[PDB]
Amino acid sequence: MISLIAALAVDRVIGMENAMPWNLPADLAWFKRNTLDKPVIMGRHTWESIGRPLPGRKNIILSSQPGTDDRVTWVKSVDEAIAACGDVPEIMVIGGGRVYEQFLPKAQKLYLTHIDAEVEGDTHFPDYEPDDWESVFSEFHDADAQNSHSYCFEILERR
């Protein structure tokens, strides 16, 4: 199955002109927990953001331009990206905006972190209809010594 994993500020903001103005190691740990030992598909901007390959995951970059790093797999279409994942139980789509938009219709599961930050968004998560999704997990957390904002983890399954 295909799943999307994303961190959403208020108004579904997922990306800004520059790095997001928060420090959420707990969210990064959640991201890692839920992507480890699964193939991850990302777009080129997200690849640049991360800086290097995500450890312990097959990294697949969806882009129309040729690849500039040999440590990851470069593909040019959605179907090629899926094919490159092979026969696995779950493929994780990790953004950004355009990649989420292309994979949402195929997705059966969303792993969302909702962050209590009001920011001006450059890119947004797709406008999904809550009516069509069932929350099967929710966990709320306050800001703390290591995390700059309150955040809530949710797992949705398509109804």
Ligand X SMILES: Nc1nc(=O)c2nc(CNc3ccc(C(=O)N[C@@H](CCC(=O)O)C(=O)O)cc3)cnc2[nH]1
Contact status: 73 vs ligand X (CB under 6 A)? no
Is the Cα dihedral 12, 49, 29, 143 positive or negative? Answer: negative
87 versus 122: smaller Cβ distance to ligand X: 122
Strand blocks (E) in the chain:
2-8, 13-15, 40-43, 59-62, 73-75, 91-93, 107-115, 123-124, 133-141, 151-158
**57 among annotated binding-site residues:** yes
The binder of 33, among ligand X, Cl ion, Ca ion, none, by C-beta within 5 to 8 A per type, is Cl ion
First to last CA, the chain: 14
In this chain, which of 36, 77, 135, 139 binds Ca ion, going by CB under 5 A? 135
The CB-of-112 to ligand X minimum distance in angstroms stands at: 7
Per DSSP, the three-state class of 117 is coil
Question: 87 or 145: whose CB is closer to Cl ion?
Answer: 145
Interaction mask 31-70, ligand X, x per CB under 6 A = xx-------------x--xx---xx---------------
